[PDB]
Amino acid sequence: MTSFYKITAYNSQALYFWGTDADVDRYVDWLNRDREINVYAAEAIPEAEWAQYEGRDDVLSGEECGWDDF
RNA sequence: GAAACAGGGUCAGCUUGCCGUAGGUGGCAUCGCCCUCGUAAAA
Known part of the structure; x- marks a missing residue:
């Protein structure tokens, strides 16, 4: 169920995840x-x-550290 | 090292007595006084 997820907002730098x-x-x-x-x-x-x-390096991953940014 | 948005909007509003009051008073001779004088003018 893990997927490449695009993260978009009006006129915002797309964030791939x-x-x-x-x-x-x-x-x-x-x-x-x-x-x-x-x-x-x-x-x-x-x-x-x-x-x-x-x-593309601009992606966050479902690895352990993909959640330390908090 | 071309093409490239800071954007698409968002009540500062809602409302609130400067008031309740508070003697300019009490009061204090304009005085005490002083010659319009001395004078020359019936052509």
């Missing part, structure tokens, strides 16, 4: 700690496209 759906939801929450507006939203990247964002 990899992990579980619960993972991405928690990362969305962390991005939305302060954003009363422009709340980052999670989007599931279609499977075929995954290899593309794969490699």
Whole structure:
């Protein structure tokens, strides 16, 4: 169920993420700690496209440390 | 080392007596005084 997750907000730097759906939801929450507006939203990247964002260093992973940023 | 948004908006509002009062008073001779004078003018 781990997926490459795109994180978007109106006119905001896209943030690509990899992990579980619960993972991405928690990362969305962390991005939305302060954003009363422009709340980052999670989007599931279609499977075929995954290899593309794969490699891109701008992705957080469902590894242990992918959650120490709090 | 081309193309590239800071953006799409968001009541400072809602409302609040400067008031209740508070002698300018009590009061204090304008005085005490002083010659319009001495004077020249019936052409």
